[PDB]
Every structure is written in C-alpha cells, then in structure tokens.
Amino acid sequence: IKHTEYMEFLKSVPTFQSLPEEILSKLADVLEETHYENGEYIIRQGARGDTFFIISKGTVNVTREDSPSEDPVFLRTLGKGDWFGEKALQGEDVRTANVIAAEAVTCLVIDRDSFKHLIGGLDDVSNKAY
C-alpha cells in the first residue's frame, strides 16, 4: 500500500509528473520515508551528502552561513511537494545549506544510485538555481 501512496504522491508533484511511470515505480520501490520533529536538522551545511529529499508532509526552513557573515541567514521555507538536497549530488558532495524541520515532517529520501539514474537528468533539477 505504501508503494501506491508513493506513486500517487509522486504523480502529483509537477517536477516528477514528467517522468515515465516505470521510473516512478522504481523510485517508489527504493525510496525511504524519514520523519522529523520541529527544530530537527535534516541537513547540516558542510556535511558530505548522498541523498535527495522530497517533502511529503510538513514544512522546512533553509538557512546558510556565508563567508562574510557570522551567523547563518534564513533563505526560504519549503513545503509539501518541494524538494532539496540536489547540490551535493551535482559534482562535489558537500551540503551547501542547512535544512531544518519546522513542524512534523515526512521526507521521501532517494539515494545517490537512484538519483543519478532516474532524477538527475530532469531539467528542473539539473538547472535549478537560487
């Protein structure tokens, strides 16, 4: 039943609606569901990463420490259907920002092996810029 929940969810996200359903089925087979509570760091800037995240429940805050700043600066809030964690899967594997849960959060987490085959070629992901 979870495979179906995942498929139905992925087919509702515009970025992933562009993917053939057999590719979505393979993502649904391999993804892992992870759960967070408010204030929990999902990603820390400076860590080395290998996973991509799609928010299926809740919201997160994104912050980043820039070289000429002392303290991390708030960037944006993401919610259900949004995704993050792609930069460490594009080239160098370093995380470039913090991502912190802002309530009860569920993420669908995709590993590097699956991302590089099934997601990384999507233009919305490969050409993402902030």
Among 9, 36, 84, 115, binds ligand 6J7 (CB under 6 A): 84
Q: Does 97 bind ligand 6J7 (CB under 6 A)?
A: yes
Q: What residues between 82 and 121 interact with Ca ion by CB under 5 A?
A: 93, 121
Q: Please identify, using beta-carbon distances, which residue of 97 and 110 lies nearer to ligand 6J7.
A: 97
Compute the chain's Rg from CA coordinates: 14
The amino acid at residue 50 is D
**Residues in contact with 52: Cβ distance below 8 Å, sequence separation at least 6, in sequence order:** 83, 84, 85, 86, 89, 109, 110, 115, 119
Distances (CA, A) of 117 to 42, 94, 110, 113: 24, 20, 11, 7
Q: Please identify, using beta-carbon distances, which residue of 39 and 121 lies nearer to Ca ion.
A: 121
Minimum separation from the CB atom of position 22 to Na ion (A) = 28
Instruction: Write out the binding residues for 3',5'-cyclic AMP.
Output: 85-88, 95-96, 130
